[PDB]
């Protein structure tokens, strides 16, 4: 109740997660997503992720893995716990155990 899930994928993934049942508009008409294609740049990616974090109602941020591949700097600087952040695979590139920020702390235990 007090917190909502939130997405950053593509059009197909945000529609998949609306079918799942997540996706919401702010009382300022801000969405729980930011669709990215060949158009927008990475500065938009990173300040969108920043305003995703600082927003004090978001608990579970899903981010497709191939999205996070170049903004690893934005999410590795994240060190708290409750702004949970999961990287998701898809058909372009499936799940890779290498570029994970939560398997970051499992050094040696593999």
């Amino acid at each position: 109740r007090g917190k909502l899930i939130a997405v950053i994928g593509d059009e197909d993934t945000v529609t998949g997660f609306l079918l799942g049942g997540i996706g919401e508009l702010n009382k300022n008409r801000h969405p729980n997503f930011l669709v990215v294609e060949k158009d927008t740049t990475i500065n938009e990616i990173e300040d969108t992720f920043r305003q995703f974090l600082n927003r004090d109602d978001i608990g579970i941020i899903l981010i497709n893995q191939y999205i996070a591949e170049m903004v690893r700097h934005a999410l590795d600087a994240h060190q708290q716990s409750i702004p949970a952040v999961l990287e998701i695979p898809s058909k372009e590139h499936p799940y890779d155990a290498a570029k994970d920020s939560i398997l970051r702390r499992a050094r040696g235990m593999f």
Binding site: R1, I5, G16, F17, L18, L19, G20, G21, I22, G59, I60, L62, S81, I82, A84, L86, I88
Partner: protein, 50 residues
């Protein structure tokens, strides 16, 4: 609680306010229905992982 530490986890209170009810009654039936079943179960599983 674990040995005095308070690990925070998540509860999935299931709300119901389904807006996607039109969804082409005659254009897309069982297909989209099972699709949203799949993706809702996936949402809950990833809540668990979070």
């Amino acid at each position: 609680n674990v040995a005095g530490v308070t690990l925070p986890v998540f509860e999935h209170y299931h709300e119901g306010t389904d807006s996607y009810e039109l969804t082409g009654l005659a254009r897309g039936g069982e297909q989209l229905a099972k699709l949203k079943r799949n993706y809702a179960k996936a949402v809950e599983l990833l809540v668990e992982l979070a």
